[PDB]
Design an enzyme around this catalytic site. Structure first.
Site, short mmCIF file in Angstrom:
data_model
loop_
_atom_site.label_atom_id
_atom_site.label_comp_id
_atom_site.label_asym_id
_atom_site.label_seq_id
_atom_site.Cartn_x
_atom_site.Cartn_y
_atom_site.Cartn_z
N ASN A 151 0.81 -1.21 0.00
CA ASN A 151 0.00 0.00 0.00
C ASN A 151 0.85 1.27 0.00
O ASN A 151 0.49 2.24 -0.67
CB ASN A 151 -0.99 -0.01 1.17
CG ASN A 151 -0.33 -0.04 2.54
OD1 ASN A 151 0.80 -0.49 2.73
ND2 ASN A 151 -1.08 0.40 3.52
N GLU A 250 4.74 -4.65 11.83
CA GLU A 250 3.75 -3.58 11.72
C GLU A 250 2.58 -4.17 10.93
O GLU A 250 2.67 -4.35 9.71
CB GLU A 250 4.36 -2.35 11.05
CG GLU A 250 5.52 -1.65 11.83
CD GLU A 250 5.02 -0.65 12.90
OE1 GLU A 250 3.82 -0.30 12.87
OE2 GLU A 250 5.83 -0.19 13.76
N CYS A 284 -3.32 0.76 7.09
CA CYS A 284 -3.41 -0.09 8.27
C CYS A 284 -4.05 0.63 9.46
O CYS A 284 -4.75 -0.01 10.26
CB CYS A 284 -2.02 -0.58 8.67
SG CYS A 284 -1.30 -1.75 7.47
N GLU A 462 8.23 1.61 14.85
CA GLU A 462 8.98 2.34 13.85
C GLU A 462 8.93 3.83 14.17
O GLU A 462 8.06 4.30 14.91
CB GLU A 462 8.45 2.05 12.44
CG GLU A 462 8.76 0.60 12.03
CD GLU A 462 8.46 0.29 10.58
OE1 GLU A 462 7.56 0.93 10.00
OE2 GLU A 462 9.11 -0.65 10.05
#
Ligand SMILES: Cc1cc2nc3c(=O)[nH]c(=O)nc-3n(C[C@H](O)[C@H](O)[C@H](O)COP(=O)(O)OP(=O)(O)OC[C@H]3O[C@@H](n4cnc5c(N)ncnc54)[C@H](O)[C@@H]3O)c2cc1C
Lengths: 488, 488, 488, 487
Positions: A151, A250, A284, A462
């Site tokens: 994405n 993630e 997400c 992150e």
């Protein structure tokens, strides 16, 4: 059509030895963008040996020498922002209005951030007694691997490679087979910036082969994965069983957006829209469970319908387009199945719910922006991540209830609250079980801000200073200057 | 013998509902110390629900209130040191000269350290622009599980529970089935100090059942495991497949002790002895590959033989005893298999290599202190962790060679160098691939000093400020005070 | 009457050699509480040599050994809380309802906080290149001096001595000549807890002699001063002329309390009362400029007058007394001069403005709770710190105006805002030029929270982790393992 | 050169003082330039300019500030040689030094802090479910730097870099001995995009321009580099005026301890670099060299051999590595100390006089000078000379040399030469100095905090802590629970 895309190993494009290829498609037209070579087991081993050699050169340089090289890559990324964004649009189907403003801009922001922090990476010193002290080194992990999702291809490649490289590692990056093109461009940019050969290698391929070979390889010290909750569990298992690698994950979510009783409903509606329909809903962190007070539900639904009616699907390079096709026909099929489940389970369809048809849409995997209301916590569309443009509106009565329902999920990625009240905003946010929390906004992810999931939505983080540290490993060293005493 | 030992859940001993039990054996005599109930799947779920309730009470207290309660537990541990040490000796076979001086003292040292750090646990604040800022919270993970090993039972339980509790979590602790007794005493001690019911529950059982039920439970947020490389790989895999848990693993090693050409050989021999024969060689960090310059090898061997002759095996409660049996008879059998492997591959037996015999030894799981020399890097005893009293001596010629051979292992836990030279000490240590490094000493593990493994020896760290933080999860919160802009 | 109070040097009371004494007065009765010996130049020299000796013993202990000793002092302070509070009430005139709940409780909270942080005090390590690295040590300053003020005598003694001692220093403490008694009790408590002789010495005396002698001494490495803005400027100047000492200064303020247009006026009035009349107005952080919107001013005045009418002056040991006399009769004369200036400059007197009269008040240094309104920015009572129970109410029209007027002062200590609005609270507070800011509260000063002044209100900070570090000095050490190159 | 003006708000401006001063070329005695001196009105103008620029600067994003300082770094690298030649004319230091050190390490520090700006963070502290604290690291506002003459542009960069990176504006007063490169830096900052007013430069003399800065009521912090006497005045006047925060980097009398197991060629090289770089005008110089008695004679021989290779001459020649002192008045003070060494019974090993002949008669040259047989009571041993004068002292045992190394009011730097692991760390841990070198001397990485113990300084420069020290902490408590009044 583009030229055939090869592997990038040790500062140059190289043919795969696997004998295997795959195609990447333009999701807006269905045309083949390129034939792409797929890395085999031997290619992965070559890439690891290349990375081991480059990492030693990279780690031996001064901290500021590393900083300057990453900053040169930042400068190239800024200059080529529009060109890279167009390529990202071709490969992903996301509108240029998004890719030119977000994907490379925020990827390069993170690289620029970590470049400046390299000289600040420090160990510690601990006095024990006059005759002994301890000091620590934050040493590189060595060779690490990043596995990307489709994405935000180049943004993910930058968010993984920036802290890994800044911490003194080499990274082998495996982009999604759906979207391999911008990662290869990034590899060239790094080399142009002066990155030593082998420090950033790119191995396109399919997850079941190239991805698995990376997770199994005995000389890779860490795997960083972005993708779905399910695929994440498999990667984490194989990384442990093979060589006990450090892991970052993630994953997806079902993040709640809580609209308080004192919220302005135009602001709440604007946030809900941006939390559900950016990148055609393929994000997400999207706020796909929208909790609205019962007393305001009808008015909020009207404001959502008005804004959804404004969404502009069309030519992805036109300035006014703000909605694209989904990345592929199989992914749209899955989104369509969720929409059918919403209807059959009794949710009320407020708008959308069908494929788009007609000139300019028949060759792409387009789904209309979709909103369900009268939703309940047991419905499949409310419980499961859809990864398409499908908002679920849920009514609630009181603050204790909405917190309970917001938290009653295995997911944990993001959350947000809309309220002008000081106490309500902090009080509610402190109780939500999510790693990324937004007050009166949605989606902004500053380079300084660590982001990642609670519960099934992730492992580790992150961005932020902590992620630079997490790409090092601590060595503790005791200097004993007193006479050592043995009891034997 | 003792009465049937029960589970510890919610501030009291409670009978297991599994219908299963196991026995712990005194390794000095072969007698049954106690029959112990094994936690079943339903017992684990009860313990998790108890832990969830206690964690909420514990986290709601002030930071200094948590500190005072852990400090009271420290005081009780200091008071009951001798009683706990005697029980540890009965359960483990380690001499009282060790358990009364090390096991509880250093376990309590870590609890005392983390108790004082609770008020210093802080998030961050990050200005973005005049109209928006970010702040972070270091939130408890919730319910965590610790799975212990048998060589330092109560010390491990304290090193896992102390940072976990100090970080605001509840921990469910599963001691090794070999050594389950002192963990139950610790649970009572914590409750006596005022720890809320449910915050520390102890579930004896076997790894394949009780341990697995913990790694699989959907409401446990983290697993911290100490044990063998093999079982760890299984734990990390099952924790991922179930609920994507955060993981810490402290596994074994094959740690190298490098004797430099300018080392005093009496010091080197003393360090080598302490790195190999403490706790009868059952220490994960033991320096079981001893590299000695060829020109010093013969003299060093003579110095080792002399010191091995001084080892005093006998009554584990006698003041002068400094060597015990191994923890169990099955473990002795495995150690004897490794010794036979060394003989069959041609390593030279310098001393030991057999069980101890005679009055007071025939009924215990005794292995003689054993030293092999003329060893090479491919031998099984050199490549694999033995976890018994077996030193391997390896000749070497130059510094570059010994660094390569020290590092040529999948293990990564500890390392050490003996040298009076400033440049040599730091230069060599900086090149070794291990997390725990000792210069002119061995074994000291201060509460302030993070410890853990590189490569296959571990994931994450214990001790130090960083481990308090690793038992929290970061929540990032953005306060947007400017007007939110939607593109729709 | 109490016995003649002596100096405390090297773990015992000792006679001063100055030949001089002074008296401390009970402000509730005018009676002499005690005759107190004044430290002369030679007494100061003796105290410094004592501190030099004790500092070496203290710093040579382990971090946890120091931690345990300070924790024992905490335990004694908790046990003796009421007795110490009664002595503080006799010496200061503050009600026991305050001293038993705040002064020792929060003083001990800070000592307890720093005791736990000692083991976390760490230096750094910085890799430069493979052949060289830097590490840092946080070393004690040596002997430091604290000079206390009279409004919170034992709290100040604890807030200065706790971080100084926890960082490995010895402190010589000079209490105010107005309030010398509780500092001497603290010295005995430290000795009873095991503090080495010389590490906390107490020298009563007058500022012009004992205080100056401390600031001038060549072997004192740092001065920490709490007191008035003017005296601070003098202390800081004299410290530089002597030996270039490090300096910390906690001075007064004229702190603004901003009541927003959306504030609840009962909450605003309660905060204003607590910000002005606690400790009879003798708190450096008091919110003595109360900015109220013009539209709410008349109603706010009425709510203040109602709460002032409830203030209960009387017997300082009675449970229901919540207002005391000022600390001394000379201080009352100064407060009355300021009240007279407010009247003569045209401020409107709403209540108070005179001494309290009648049985039980005529012999104490009582001033009635006083409120002025219609105040303007040029008035003496608005520009200057009064340090008595005198609130100034100022009308304002808009947010930009009140921020400008709040900041238009040489003072910078504290500030606060009363508003339920998320954006208003953070937006306003971020623009105020003060080090200590309270939203919808006043006065709380957690041990974790660094506190101190902007502009003329201070140098440096107290409390928080940073203040422990500020009582150490950094030593940077470079290890050069490569060959040194000379250009000569 | 043309008459030099003040730099205020992004442009050169005439001073309002009516006063000027001259900077002399120490190699020729000629006037390099006439420089306008900022008066009290000029300082107030600079402060108001700085107040305006700081608000623009602080309102930018952290990365916007980072990029601008990085552009200044790029300009400094490109103009290294041009700036170095100007520095050599103003200071007398050889081009071989100025082109390799002064701008390079000045820019290194700016570059370091530019990258740390986004990492400047406050804290968050939970108190209870209903209340929490967070902190902001806010700019101090307008700060002033007062520079010394030995490293003019490096000092300007080491003070301005953390100050600017923390969101402040700085008014910089270079030494009147060496004002020229600071004005160049002001132009470079503006060229890089620094907002007008954020870096203003006010040349002038210490007694007037410097004092006016320390007295101004709207300056929040003073950072001073120079001598102890001027420092005591600066810190006093800053307190008496407005209670300013103060940082001071003063001189030292730093000891170099040669251990019994030291290689004497290495020790001699370190002593040479610790004493004769920049003609001995370095605050951190190791001007007390302690050598074991048993090696004293050999060490003296090795020092003499290296001194003989020193190359005084044309400051623009490649092989020149020794220059004149910064000024003729500074030389007379150095000669005063040398004559004190002779009269107090120290043995002159070499040097001790001015240099003479063609090319030296017109410059402020002092020969490299070494005294031995020194004792702790001698003036040359106790007081900072700030010229090329090494003092060699014999010692017998480790405890003694540590006591003697520490027996000073100074505290800036120290070093030990030894191959032994225990001896290096054990000795260094006992020395009362802020900057310690093992088997080296002089390197001052941007990451490494540096400053003095005791009379040698207040505070530190460089490292992450110095970025923080140019902010002030604001603590903010959010009370979400109901406030309780006792009245
Ligand atoms: C049916 C059955 C009966 C057993 N009965 C006994 C018995 O009576 N006595 C006895 O001493 N041992 C018993 N065992 C265990 C057996 O001895 C194993 O070798 C066991 O792994 C030994 O554990 P350890 O602590 O020595 O070693 P490790 O395997 O390193 O165990 C370290 C820790 O991890 C736990 N652990 C091990 N495997 C897992 C796993 N898969 N998931 C989670 N946690 C795990 C262990 O219990 C221990 O707490 C039994 C096992 C089974 C399947």
């Amino acid at each position: 059509r583009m030229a055939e895309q090869q592997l990038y190993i040790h500062g140059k494009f190289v043919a795969a030895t696997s004998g295997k290829t795959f195609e990447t498609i333009n999701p807006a037209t269905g045309e083949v963008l390129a034939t792409v070579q797929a890395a085999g087991r031997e290619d992965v081993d070559r890439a690891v040996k290349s990375a081991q050699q480059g990492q030693k050169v990279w780690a031996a340089m001064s901290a500021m020498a590393r900083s300057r090289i990453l900053r040169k890559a930042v400068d190239i990324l800024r200059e080529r922002n529009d060109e890279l964004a167009r390529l990202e649009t071709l490969d992903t189907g996301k509108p240029l209005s998004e890719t030119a403003a977000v994907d490379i801009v925020t990827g390069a922001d993170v690289l620029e951030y970590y470049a400046g922090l390299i000289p600040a990476l420090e160990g510690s010193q601990i006095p024990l007694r006059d005759s002994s002290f301890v000091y620590t080194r934050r040493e590189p992990l060595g060779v690490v691997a990043g596995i990307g999702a489709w994405n935000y291809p180049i943004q993910i490649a930058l968010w993984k490679s920036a802290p890994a490289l800044a911490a003194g590692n080499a990274m082998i990056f495996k982009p999604s087979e759906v979207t391999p093109l911008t990662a290869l461009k990034l590899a060239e940019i790094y080399r142009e910036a002066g990155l030593p050969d082998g420090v950033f290698n790119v191995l396109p391929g399919i997850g079941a082969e190239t991805g698995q070979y990376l997770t199994e390889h005995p000389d890779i010290a860490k795997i960083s994965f972005t993708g779905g909750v399910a695929s994440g569990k498999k990667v984490m298992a194989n990384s442990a069983a093979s060589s006990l690698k450090e892991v970052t994950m993630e994953l997806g979510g079902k993040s709640p957006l809580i609209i308080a009783e004192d919220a302005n409903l135009d602001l709440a509606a604007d946030i809900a829209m941006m939390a559900n329909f950016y990148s055609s809903g393929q994000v997400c962190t999207n706020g796909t469970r929208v909790f609205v007070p019962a007393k305001f539900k009808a008015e909020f639904e009207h404001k959502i319908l008005e804004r959804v009616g404004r969404i502009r699907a069309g030519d992805l390079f036109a300035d006014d387009t703000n909605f694209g096709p989904l990345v592929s026909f199989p992914h749209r099929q899955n989104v369509l199945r969720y929409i059918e489940s919403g209807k059959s389970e009794g949710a009320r369809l407020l708008c959308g719910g069908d494929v788009l048809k007609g000139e300019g849409f028949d060759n792409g995997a387009w789904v209309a922006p979709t909103v369900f209301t009268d939703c309940t916590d047991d419905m499949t569309i409310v419980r499961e991540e859809i990864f398409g443009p499908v908002m679920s509106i849920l009514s609630y009565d009181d603050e204790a209830e909405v917190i309970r329902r917001a938290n009653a999920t295995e997911y944990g990625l993001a959350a947000g609250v809309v309220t002008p009240d000081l106490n309500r905003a902090h009080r509610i946010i402190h109780q939500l079980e999510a790693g990324i929390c937004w007050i009166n906004s949605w989606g902004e992810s500053p380079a300084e801000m660590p982001v990642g999931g609670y519960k099934h939505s992730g492992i580790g983080r992150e961005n932020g200073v902590m992620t630079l540290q997490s790409y090092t490993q601590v060595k503790s060293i005791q200097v004993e200057m007193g006479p050592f005493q043995s009891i034997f």
